[PDB]
Amino acid sequence: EGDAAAGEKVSKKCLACHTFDQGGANKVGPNLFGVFENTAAHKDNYAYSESYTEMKAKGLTWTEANLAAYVKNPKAFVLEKSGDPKAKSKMTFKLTKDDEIENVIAYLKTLK
Ligand code: HEM
């Protein structure tokens, strides 16, 4: 689902905190090239909130459906999927429009 060309547009909403290119810098949040189908806490050089390390132990991978639920409300996400009530997220920013989420995901799928 999802037009990865409208997705690239929406993605401009993430660029204050993230980069997209291969080898890219960790600005505020980790670079997101390669994120699709990859583990939670997927970048080794970024210091993630403990809650992402605990999704990653569980074997959570960034599927279409877990990116969908995440980018709707990261903080509810990380509580939910970690099982740790004291779960923190530094993200905070959410997408609320369904078309947007679907399109953004379709454009994450083209970055490896
Ligand atoms: C639609 C726009 C964005 C998308 C697609 C995006 C996607 C994601 C993804 C998939 C992760 C987790 C990667 C991992 O588990 O390895 C993440 C982490 C994070 N994002 Fe974003 N994000 C977006 C916008 C933002 C913006 C606007 C901010 C800052 C205001 C930001 C800050 C962060 C931070 C700080 C983390 C790490 C969280 C922590 O360890 O607590 N993100 N992002």
Swiss-Prot record:
Pfam families linked: Cytochrom_C
InterPro entries: Cyt_c-like_dom, Cyt_c-like_dom_sf, Cyt_c_1A/1B
Keyword vocabulary terms for this entry: Electron transport, Heme, Iron, Metal-binding, Photosynthesis, Transport
Binding positions for heme c per the UniProt entry: C14, C17, H18, M91
Domain of life: Bacteria
Signal peptide residues on this chain, from the entry's feature table: none
PTM annotation: Binds 1 heme c group covalently per subunit.
GO biological process, one term: photosynthesis
GO MF terms held by the record: electron transfer activity; heme binding; metal ion binding
Disulfide bonds: none
Family statement: Belongs to the cytochrome c family.
Function of the molecule: Cytochrome c2 is found mainly in purple, non-sulfur, photosynthetic bacteria where it functions as the electron donor to the oxidized bacteriochlorophyll in the photophosphorylation pathway. However, it may also have a role in the respiratory chain and is found in some non-photosynthetic bacteria.
Protein name: Cytochrome c2
Organism of provenance: Rhodospirillum rubrum
Lineage summary: Bacteria, Pseudomonadati, Pseudomonadota, Alphaproteobacteria, Rhodospirillales
